[model samples]
Target: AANDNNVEWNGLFHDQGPLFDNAPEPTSTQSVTLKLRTFKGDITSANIKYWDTADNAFHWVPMVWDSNDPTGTFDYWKGTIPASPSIKYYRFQINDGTSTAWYNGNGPSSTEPNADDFYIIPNFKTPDWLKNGVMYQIFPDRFYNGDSSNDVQTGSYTYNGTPTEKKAWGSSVYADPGYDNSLVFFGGDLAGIDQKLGYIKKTLGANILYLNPIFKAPTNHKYDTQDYMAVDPAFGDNSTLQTLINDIHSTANGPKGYLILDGVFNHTGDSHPWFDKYNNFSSQGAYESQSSPWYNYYTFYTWPDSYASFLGFNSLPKLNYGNSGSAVRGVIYNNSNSVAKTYLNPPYSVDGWRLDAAQYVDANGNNGSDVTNHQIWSEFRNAVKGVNSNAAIIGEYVGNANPWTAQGNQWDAATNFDGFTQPVSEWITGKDYQNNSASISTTQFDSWLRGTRANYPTNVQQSMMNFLSNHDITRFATRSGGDLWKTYLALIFQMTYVGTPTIYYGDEYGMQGGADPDNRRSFDWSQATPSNSAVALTQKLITIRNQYPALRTGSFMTLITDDTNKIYSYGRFDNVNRIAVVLNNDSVSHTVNVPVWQLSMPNGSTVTDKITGHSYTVQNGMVTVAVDGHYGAVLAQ
Candidate 1:
């Protein structure tokens, strides 16, 4: 809140609580987290209220306790909103009550006159893989809406009918699928995906293909899975999927080489056979009425003898693990043979399973053992490894998952929600970065990375899934006010940081959308356009990342973070390769002093800037990096 450090005024607002102390911003995903602060003080719980902007009015929303520190600050509060191009204003009440006490500054006790307006901007960091993998996220049906013959309309549907949009959900009135923006089904099949494989491979590199959910589900987004064994007919049959896999795997540059399917295990659609029996309280259900073999598999509410549901969705019934009568519950229990016979080893091989809401799947508190908890996850993992040792299992946990993952029991890796997106997003677009002030510097970024590096084991750190955007939230470009430079800087940081980076479907192409349906827009095959520009930039970054193992598997050392000038410089050193990534978030170009002590290179070792191909001399372990404003350079030895 320093205006040119012009003067220090400690008065009315001086006692005000400190602005949300430095920490990572929430990633562009559904899961939200409260940031932690390092400030020391006798601060009580601060009551904060937020409003969502609509038309010309602000709407009241839920206010939860981000952190409760009666004595010392635990962590700062972070906010979560569903869409982009949004603004939220918060007023902290002295005694944690808006009605009783309302103040704009830090607190009612220590008021600082210069307490500035507080705001959190979206900062996006492009992962290393995204920088190079001409990536694409296919929503299966919406991309091409192929197979006019497969198109079907509801009995009550009547509007400009197009084969592209026909089937409507719970709607008697139908509009042309082409025009209707509501939930409708068009036939975007696996055959259609197979047909475009060549185009995708040629256009976007297609090194890795991330399918949203090709499993059997009634809805377009296959999060509510009906069956994992069978591929959805609309998308393709088992044979169709095999054909695509074989073709892509054989193709020289196709995504078949690396394929990842959606792993949804939290709950199943009510339409699933298991759920049908479970919902009806039949002999096969997990309820009290019936003598079902899997009766104890599910957790039930007392009032109604129905199988439990996740959150409040009745359509998705929870699963019962190794209960009483059913052998299916424990079929994959600690045995690869059973798992292969039941789950993984099916029509074709799968590289990994992305566990859905993994944290929730494993119950906490007094709830007895969760069948799908880490123990079962480990059992399933053993089966996967027994079949394919290299296979990976990733969980959808956003918070600290090391407690479960570190035991080496369940998942091979977990999402790096904290390290990858949060801090990077905050640093690139938060108040400090946007305002071009020293307050918003990369100091927090260094702190977060250091914390993660220290908290998790080396193996977990290396395998963490890192990404900038996904199907769940807003695109980075849109979140950053269409500032391409900010996005570029984030990528530089991500690729150099620790983790196995993943690029969402259209991030490389700069696809712009906000939240659920919008974020899930169809991939425009007509022309790549602006997305391609970012795609090129990403590809170059990936090239640097892939060529130098230091970028991926090296030890991170921060040589300099000029907080005063708003510059971030760090180096990654491997046994044989050493690389430095210099980020200039400032407005003007600045010369960076490279420290010789930071480098482990030989006496006369030479380094090259992969971005510009300009060679630099490393004398006494020092390499000077001259960077333009909002520009970055990668130096490798």
Candidate 2:
């Protein structure tokens, strides 16, 4: 088999280099030059094989050998292709007189180029600030309770046959069977978050704060929006939200903070004015009469009592975007006064949106049709960007989001569940939070990481929201069986890996829970002390990430993966700095030799471990470091 050892993967000759400009994205009509690096000096010829969408056929272009570097470590070759509005897929064929091999997005390939081949988009770009910043995701009802005045009172309302109640601070979530968890609130309003901005900025070193849905809704989750234009009174008024955004953006010394609001376009609360099933408003609604102006906004199998809802949830009435005159689409994104545009303009000036259940927005969950979803999302993107060009739009997808992210116009990025969280969880906990997943080897985890990342553009990969756990699943610490060492290893990977690292609230304080309501526990201010090991370790990791530019926005390269020993090593590097990370997932310590030559690190270079303050020197292009059992180290030069 032809292997990567027969070739050298040079960052300078990869996707964003040699072929494109220094910018992560490109514009139309620009000339693209592709290059490849080879280890064997006896190489005879090379050719660029490409798929042209216009002709719908494969073609070949000869490549010429470029000059070698001063160290003579590898030989470089180049070819040029004219950019177009359509996607251009291409791969390289290297021949060394006696043998031939192929290369694609996954590096040296044994088969012909497929859909995973390297491709280029003409006019796609992501916000520069988003590419390297840290993100913090907050579940509004669980973070903190700063203002008791706006808290939900007991028995204020009834939902799903149960009465609503506001639990005391630091109380365990109601987990009894048949309990209406959605109706229970803990008073974690926006004012609480407003009061904690100093801690989030100075202590955690995060620049982006992603708050879950805060629209007027009946449930605690707020996925079923009642009014698209109004903020939930339980959370706060629009003015409070504006003040929070202003405080984050106008900081004293650190980086400017960005606020991302969650957008739910798939459904509306059953009590919404458009539905008016409860007779809550005076206006006629779809459930009341056919003459209602909003009648076409919802689909109905039977009038008044039966209609399409999201995933069969009666409390959430699904919206119909396929209808040409549907007011739902206009209210969501099409009009200048729409909900998506309102927060992106003037006083509020939110940085972006994190769309909820974005895949099912235009599709009927039960009937399953997505004829207009892409078009609607494209319009949503245009509307938001028209207000602020730097405003980012991300989506929540269950599986591969290639269709939404690869095109560059629909979404800036996604939550990155399939790419980062799933694989890492499986590797660390021996099972995913879903309860039936099997354990996977380190090699399998690495393969998953490479395969999933290959589908996205480089800029999208950097902007992805990388996280281990959120409000929808089991807490990562609990999933790891409360092993603090395992938690440390996983956090090390999240902080050093490519993308925007997003930390779930209370995770730093060693909070643990299982499933939905359990995972959404209140933040324990008592555990915020520096005496807690988990909190101290988390703070250290954040400090390390803030101190190194390579760990923030650098290229990643794998150096070692020993499945038998459960050890993995990789490096993040740029032109001036390089950081190496090694993880040993075994029960006993292991001394491993890491090859530093792959990163072009010169012999005799000194490196220091930011985690333990240990030091090492490179010898013969290799560095020997001893890592503790069930722990890791972040080495930097």
Candidate 3:
């Protein structure tokens, strides 16, 4: 029974660090498990003692220790001392046969690392507010560089393996002109973003900020994470991020801030240490020998040169998520104490993670797999929430996200690709209808919304993020064939519809871009010189949404949808709160003649307009409004 491994004792073994688990209070008869691991010898017949520190010394309470499993286990460790409240700290004392008593660290030929400490790992529960919060995604580099100090000189750092000459003001490049959607990096950092918090809050009424990866990454869009712990120096380091979050939260009339960084958990940079092993495996490097304790962490396709790759990208090597053979690498993935922990528990505090390629993480919780996996989201959500309970879990799935949002699932919400894009394409973009932008009919729009609503649960329906356009696709204004009016109409529909709406950064003031490079343009703060400011309409829509809680947290009630004329009108009503929202998306001027009595509104009752402040009278059993071509109106009764 000789334990000779270097046992590094960091303070507070179990309750140490920022992670806190909300384990259930132990019951006398119920069984409980203490899941733990050790690097050295097998742990057996440990003297388990429960202690409460009142005057600073250990006051022992009776507990049993049992070990009978291959992976090793501590059994009969549950009890109820009614007098003792749920307090911090628990110690498990182990007695090897070499010592008479399992006393604190006096055994011959043994040096215990730290006594195995155990506490209940908390269960995962997402907050209700997060489920319905509207999220605005921002790319820091191209966003707005408000601070001149943080602006990296063009010749200061090499990009893509080449040195760049100093750039003048307003100078821009396609980064990769061949692929229009390829990335271009600007000098926008966290400091720049913090300087322009007022602009973000003023334009889009979003409280939650979903930022792309800001870790120490090489590329503009940081999908290839170099280091998970430190904030990228290009992005103004960790301190600037903390200031941004704090200032935004305390801004005058600004909404409270909740920050979520992109979690690139599936793979690491080719520069990462794990890949170093794969590169030199033939020389009996760390990856070639299992005894090196880092060999099984990566999947090597062929020795020496080729490692398991992600989508033919040599710069990224897939991680072996739950490889027990590689304790060091195992700590990086599944263990809560590794690199992932740094992102989860940051100095500024990360409320959650938008898992990058989450579905690709091994569903079995170990080794990358080719087959589509859903369990990655589950395990990620659990691990993240295990550290921070209020953390939200969102995924990036291109096609139908229904399976991800299935009951008892890992993801809290998804992109709502089908519901958001399909409807807009059919009703607004008119992409499917002979590429005729004028052919977009109200029938298609209504059908898409109704169909999407029916597919998801009531909770999921309300949680769905409704949006005009995001970083992935073409801008809404560009997609609408440069018709600003049509774009306005689409905005009206999205804002008033029965889901949380998100406004892309530049869409507020008629910014136009096509495909990739054009769509992801730098923020023109100079354009803040508002001409015919569409900001009024955006503010109007947001104000209306804020005034009517039913619009945000209500069910859809279809009043009328005419396919022949392509006119559709719907109402969102909260029966319990006695609030209703009516919307009309029509091509020409038409009266929204819905039966008032059916919706419990009195005949001849007047409903107020939150947007226009005009009053419309309900008369002769119908509520009518003159909705012009591609126009929408919201009615609150």
Candidate 4:
């Protein structure tokens, strides 16, 4: 449209998914045949613009008119890119016989764009179970209390100069930001998680467990780690964690499961033995003695009183990866016995890691902003994957994650704040994750989702951990003013979206909270059953997701975007099946006409709503369906 050309902007599409690219995850020695789609007879010619990393040059290969789609609504073009050892960066250039439009993973652009090209990284694959698995994120201290025997008693300890306080289950977390919230405990241990495996697996049908930091740390959140090898006593010891992990790996429940621990390699607690400010342990510390063996592990600005801390929090000191073969480097990931490798092997046998403050794990005070950070993550990948090839490395970056996610050498995927959470929150709740006002129409939401989805390869997109609420942000219900229906809408999209859906512990029942300790509220045991409408709806969606492989890993295409009516529709399909999702963000019911031709479904083809069990027939390349306000329908054929 911008080029004033006959090329169909809405129809022009290509991705690294198997539907468009013959082999999305191609090995270095394998050549790839890519396909592009445009409206029938809309463009006279097509060319594939590829940048060869091996020779550092750009080349354009003419694409042949492959064939017309079965629906007769779109034309196809094909081009083959020969094999090469280096990563392939490519896009499509189409000419309507007058002006031209450039297309990449993002979408069609009027002119040649410099960024967001599709990629083909050789031999780089995220775990199969990860992409196919549904994620359940648990904040251990707040999920459930199974073993009261291991509960930390009131006044049993002191951290940050405040006596530890044991709060009753479902009690209110402190409201003030300056409160010593770390000392507040609810006794939700690894046993708690183990006890609720039935609810997470059988009830919700989620197979991936992403636990918040459980390592030995003084705080409730466990972001400032005390010892990477020791599971926090308050959360149970190492063996207790092993039992949980072993159970998760077992198939006795709904499906075979995977456990991903939260790795806080960015910093260490001030009370850690290596940095014992109060001499809590017998070992020499950089704080107590300058001659300590681990002195080089930290960046000391002025003797003991001043050091490089995370975001300037004196209690959390950032680790310093000195020179190559440095002690800390060997201790963290380089060596065989390093913490990163240890948990992935033997007794623990953890499946993966969700890195905490991953972007800030850098050399000394650099805070991971330099090239050294990439090298560190690359080394970390080698260490983790060496022990278990299926282990996932998920990074935490609120902003764009292309620097780490685009290149397969580093993270498999990011937390997905930039793509899923932010756009969905703004569209449905009219507010950002932090509870601030941010209005966005259906058009903006579509653009946002498309733009961010282009940042990573299809594999990485499928593996991204998409969530509505997490430990660091306000509860999604809180952002939507405690509207339960809006959460239902979010869950519908979350389950059907391109990325992996991650459900925060209490989010299944529309839990409410503001920020910090509040957002990390205790899970309500009473609402765990499907008797609750929200829980029942969640169960149905999860069951549908588990039953449909196409929903987990498939191609996505927008069919409708109506800003005035606050309605949006898209199609997710594979060779096996085609699923269409119609969502109404408006506060009233509305009937939407979805164009099924985009997914190649002909007239009179029956489509059934997986959630409601209602059936509809396609007529004239479209199906009209009614959707309630703040709700959606997942129809599949």
Candidate 5:
């Protein structure tokens, strides 16, 4: 339909479509030419509004009329700009003598534009293997026990007023809040992970392994680091870890496995040599004398009788990074022989680090000094990437990571809690442990999902660690009231969402637990049988994600979101293929019709369901399907 001015919405000519050049990631310092197509002889002028990083303001650049077809049905206009290292935001505008039109990421816009709504990341790149890969997060102490000989002995040492003891292999984790359950070890070690590598790769279909802190520490969780250089004795020695890494990298006929270690640089255990509260090491530590070489690494009040610790915990003394010549900074990054560079360089050559409690690091609250956490992180990135440029450095920020992720120099990505997990959980199950007070609708969920994806650079959004349940929260199955079907719907969203899917250990096999130590339960291999519906469903979803590049790196668009009906539909598409996902969260079966034209598919295009092998043809620009209650369908072309 053409207006009196001959200007038309020619669905094919818009540059915002996924097939448009420079749709998402663009190389740095490269010239990107954006094109707009309009009906022949319809537009008098066209311009592109772009954000200039130097000026921090929007500017309009006129586009030149490039060419017209022999048939005279369409004409092309173009604008060219040099890409910068940061994200570049832009929109298109077309004008006839009488009327003007605007275009943004979501195509034509009638309202004021948001900068993040349409953008491209320039000169930023994540690891090629990590973008769509599945990650398995293992709590080493609970996964499995391969070597009983390395188990922690009972009464060997006391941790936080509790004696160290090894529980039976299949026993439930101790549930005593008084003892903190921090010392209850289940004998899981690196050798155990080594023994199960075949299963982790083939059965679990994970290419990346993310382990909680394995550094030398007294506690089971190992957040309070004792020695950054040494592997925890309970988790096997340094040689064992090295062998495991070597084995993961050399798997035959399988995706090369990568390892991400946990980094806890915010504080050190009271038992660490630098802290030396128990006088465990021969070195002169801050607890022993004021003249100690490592004295400046920590803060002390009343001559070491009291000190600043993380969240006021007396056993975990916070590191002081603000002092000149601070040992904490020296050990972290300043020195050439820093702990951050050691493992990333040598034969071990781990992939990256998941910084624990990253937000509180490098903040000096003793004298009300200014915090420099971002500066420290920037330096940390340089140190780690200096040794291994491909290595990733993700952080543990629970809320909006924009302050850290938006800056290209800081963290590469973050544990996606605020952006994906919490909102999706609230929308699907009507409850999230973090936001239980509020009821979240599908509309709010879509808003958060799109807005969060828009806020970050393309690299950060694609590489985020998307997970349903991790060690710190209630398990997904437990939160869904033991409803396996609900968990299945969440898994479908997780696998197809625009992030690296991370499955917490035991989540694939219907594991259920309530919080902290409970969530950190032992992996049950018995539940991995073929009869287990959850395990089979998880495997199928992983297979689908692995088979489709669109699910991995494609652009996302919402086709339909009915808040009242609790139905959601979206599509992930690239130039080569298109996949539509429809979810029915209601209690009764519902018939839904999703617009296929939004995906640029013409009438009569065929789509087949990957799950049920059902086929449907686009009719009148829409595709109709009947989705069962508490289920979903993955339709692909």
Candidate 6:
């Protein structure tokens, strides 16, 4: 083990979490006890290189000898990351006298990389539920219909010059050119979600409920919020929304549950009283009068006819916050009665917010840049945390969420598109979220995953919302050509991979759909049965995920990647249990040789597949697992 090959390049590991770092969630006054692992009797010295934000400089501290694993293959070293009022970052520097190497959250690095370094925030913690619980996202009008009474009536009224068309449950979802589909309504309501609470908790085993905006908007998708304080009348009333929140918050079905509401604070529907583009409100509006009390809430390039809208959709009028603060800020989050604070309070104590178009939350009528955007989100984060310290503030960022999440003063997590789902889609389906052809091999996929994982702190990585597909994209199943095995592969990786697995409604049963309005089709509850293969797999994975804290909060290690066989194997472990996931992306079965030594599992140890109940014995340093094509296995010791 003292050989240079074993000592310098291939013997080091460091990760930030409960096992490796004592203060994974540290406060301003708290210092962190950090640990690093190396081959037994290999490294002569270890140092923790940290970047202190206060002075904008790098410093190193010596690490003392720590304990060894049971197998004695490695030894651990302990160092300290000093307390700081702001955010700082650090990496492990290993020396074996003859050569030097380094380790960061991603993996062993020969060169010192700045961006991927592990972060240490003075005082920040995301909600525990986000870390430990599985998330289920429901498009309010498509999940289920528990209250037909609250359903929108056919041809009831008109918005955007199209009469509201109420459709039957489970009808085919389609789109037309005039944007008329925006007004097409499905009758699912808050009671619908309440009625399916048992299904969400016990059946699907998902605990966190994320509802797409249920606020008052004339359209089916409530992204264009008409009123911040009111629930959409087409879906339900204030009391109905309150009742649903109470039911979700109750611990009747399983453990105490959490609710995440979609926060569309960046813009409002032109029909909003503040904007009033359609002459729908009595009060003077920004669209009508220059002297309107709320005229400053919006940015007008040229007084009435032209203004900044969300992605140039005139229906979605972007709100202006004017450099510091304004009435819009007060109405959205600052005031006690503000939408953000009000929901976090009694009767509707929502656990968190899913920030919609978070980056576009601009100031002074300008599209958000680094300065303005960061300022708004920092303010929003403070406002939300003030009411609920443990509340989750997950952003709708597409690529590299480090700008906001790495700081810890802003968002806790981001919807992991670029990191998880996109690569997975390319690897498994030979396509991207847009259904365009884009393929990747197991090696490429693993590289992509490692590269992206390097972007966040460990805790933030665990909280990232990993999903196969979401509301705005083409469904994963469709991308897979309706192949159930591919769906199984995605699901297996979804449950076992680092970060929280977020299930878009109907994705549980290999539901098929195409683009936006199409992907937003109504849920079919009939597919949720024990007999459905996808359904059974969904329930089983959820149970395994909930049962093992190691799977949710653990150090991830890559064992082997076989692009020829299309196999990927890795381990996720903590002090309690060591778990390995064997994934096969091909169409036929393949036997994968997984290295268990990296997990510190000794020869003769037995690891059982939590999904199949088949056990394998470790021989030498590896275990052999037979993984089905387009399916996977989860092994635990």
Q: Each prediction's TM-score against the native?
A: 0.68, 0.94, 0.71, 0.97, 0.91, 0.97
Candidate 2, residues 1-637, lDDT tens digits: the string is: 1233343333223544212224346687776786676653646778888887777888888989786643466566888776667667788887765556777767775556566777667787778778778888898988888788888877777664667778888877883344478877899998999888877877767888999889898888898888978889988998888888888897673568999999988888888888877767899888888998888778787887788887888788888876443567778887778888888988788999998878877743333325478777887888888899899998988678888877777999998889998898898888785644657888888888988888888778888989888888888888888888888888889889878888998887668989988889899988875678777777788888878777766777777889878999988877667788999988888998887766667778888989899899989878898899888888888
**Whose lDDT is higher: candidate 1's or candidate 4's?**
4
The alpha-carbon RMSD values of the candidates against the true structure, listed in the order shown, are 15.8, 2.8, 19.8, 2.1, 3.5, 1.6
As a whole number from 0 to 100, the lDDT of residue 45 in candidate 5 is 82
lDDT score, candidate 6, position 478? 99
Better of 4 and 5 by TM-score: 4
Model 5 residue runs over 4 Å out of place are 4-18, 21-28, 35-46, 63-78, 83-88, 93-109, 114-122, 175-179, 323-326, 363-371, 435-437
lDDT of 3 by residue, 150-242 (tens): 665555555345443323334553543322222345677888777777666665566777787888766667777666777877788777777
On residues 1-637, what C-alpha lDDT tens digit does candidate 5 reach at each position? 2445544655325533344455345677776677776776777788888886766888778999887543345677888767666556788877776667777654565444676545565655566677878999999999888888889976677865677876777787874454548888888999999988887887868889999999899998988888999999888999999999988886682678999999888889888888788887899788888898888788887668788887888888888888545667888876767778878877789999998888888745342212477778877887887888889888898887867766577888999998888887788777785425445877778878877776676668888999998988888888788888888788888888898999999888779988788899898888875568877778788888998888988877777788778888988877788888998888788899987666656678899877677899989878889988778888888
Q: Could you tell which candidate, 3 or 4, scores higher by TM-score?
A: 4
Indicate which candidate wins on lDDT. Answer: 4
List model 4 lDDT by residue over 1-637, tens digit each. Answer: 2234677788888776567888888888898899898888787789998898887999888999888877788888999998877887998889986868998877889989898898888888899899998999999889988789888777778776677778888888772343367778888999989988999999889999999988888778888788888888888888898899888989986688999988888889998989998788899999988999888889999989999988999999889987667788898888878888889888778899998888988887687857988888888888888889899999999988988967788899999999999999999999999999998999999999999998888899999999999998999989989789999999999999988899998899999999887899888889999998789998999898888888888888888899989999998887778889999999999988888888988788999988779999999988899998989999898
lDDT: worst 10-residue window of model 6:
3-12
Please identify model 6 stretches exceeding 4 Å from their true place.
3-8, 175-179
lDDT of each prediction vs. the true structure? 0.55, 0.79, 0.56, 0.87, 0.79, 0.86
Measure candidate 3: CA RMSD.
19.8
What residue runs in model 2 are displaced by over 4 Å at the alpha carbon?
1-23, 40-42, 67-71, 175-179, 323-326, 363-369
Q: Return the lDDT, model 3, position 483.
A: 71
Model 4 pairs in collision: none
What RMSD does model 5 have? 3.5
Q: How accurate is candidate 2 locally (lDDT)?
A: 0.79
